[PDB]
Design a protein around this nucleic acid. Structure first.
Length: 145
RNA sequence: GGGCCCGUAGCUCAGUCUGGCAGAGCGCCUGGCACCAGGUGGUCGAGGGUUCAAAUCCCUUCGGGCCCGCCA
């Protein structure tokens, strides 16, 4: 319907309130997202693949974690008081939550550096050589296995 | 993370509950006139345990498939 809007924001203090407002959005840990392609592929899996979660936006989070467990996904790639990736379909929705966490918007916060690569490879159990994001998508694609 | 089913002849699978000679159909070989008769079939996924006796029960494990919970 609406085009997905994805923008990372640097230095955000997360308030658990935002999850009790019934707003169509998803917020991730920017420091563990391979790139904008990571989130896009997760949304693709959420849109198409067989549901694991009772919500589409929750389905994004679990697909981003590369595994079925819902609570593990919240820990693996859930937003943690800092660099985050806000995901919306309504501009007003994005504006609302940003007012509740703050932080200068910086899409580079979703770009990957060597320290982020070590973190992602350790987190996503990426044991081996090969382009990090390529095998991040590969791990997400086979959640249905 | 939790729960369930399959694995047995070359193939499809019964048999497992309730331990008691390893079975059917299918094909395969032979002979006879597609059909008839004779013949042919086993690392029971693996290991270990229990037992006089295990495909069968217990533990463990490999391979294939299915379901579920977690919903900041």
């Amino acid at each position: 319907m609406d085009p997905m809007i994805i923008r990372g924001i640097r230095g955000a203090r997360i308030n658990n309130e935002i999850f009790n407002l019934g707003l169509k959005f998803q917020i991730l840990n920017a420091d563990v997202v391979a790139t904008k392609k990571h989130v896009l592929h997760a949304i693709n899996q959420a849109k198409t693949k067989k549901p694991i979660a009772k919500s589409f936006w929750m389905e994004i989070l679990v697909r981003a974690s590369g595994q079925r467990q819902i609570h593990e996904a919240i820990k693996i790639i859930g937003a943690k008081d800092g660099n985050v990736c806000l995901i919306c379909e309504d501009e007003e929705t994005f504006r609302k939550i940003y007012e509740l966490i703050g932080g200068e918007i910086d899409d580079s916060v979703l770009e990957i550096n060597e320290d982020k690569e070590r973190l992602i490879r350790e987190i996503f159990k990426i044991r081996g050589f090969g382009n990090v994001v390529e095998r991040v998508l590969e791990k997400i694609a086979l959640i249905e296995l």
